[PDB]
């Protein structure tokens with residue numbers, strides 16, 4: 502029984518995750534490259 | 550040669566993001582060579598890294 506949520510009307514920089522947040526053992530992207538997530542805009546985003 | 554933490558070992562590779570790939574050490578996209586990594590828990594201690 503997993504959740505889902507929708508994120509909208511917001512600005513997202515991943516550098517904020519660097520300060521005080523725990524590291525990430527797995528970080529894998531398929532349709533995009535991680536080096537180009539700071540220069541894009543997405544029509545819709547969903548989080549599971 | 551350097552010393553990192555385990556979760557950061559995956560970051561020593563072309564086309565990666567993170568603190569150990571943007572502000573600390575980076576590798577060109579056309580990188581020829583090899584990468585070796587091994588655990589060194591017993592010999593490395595303290596808070597001097």
Ligand SMILES: *[C@@H]1O[C@H](CO)[C@@H](O[C@@H]2O[C@H](CO)[C@@H](O)[C@H](O)[C@H]2NC(C)=O)[C@H](O)[C@H]1NC(C)=O
Pocket residue numbers: 517520521
């Ligand atoms: C970096 O992390 C520290 C963790 O303490 C943040 O410190 C507090 O963060 C809250 C929320 O951003 C602020 O309201 C406080 O004013 C901060 N206090 C301190 C110690 O400055 C700090 O803000 C973070 N900085 C960032 C996100 O760059």
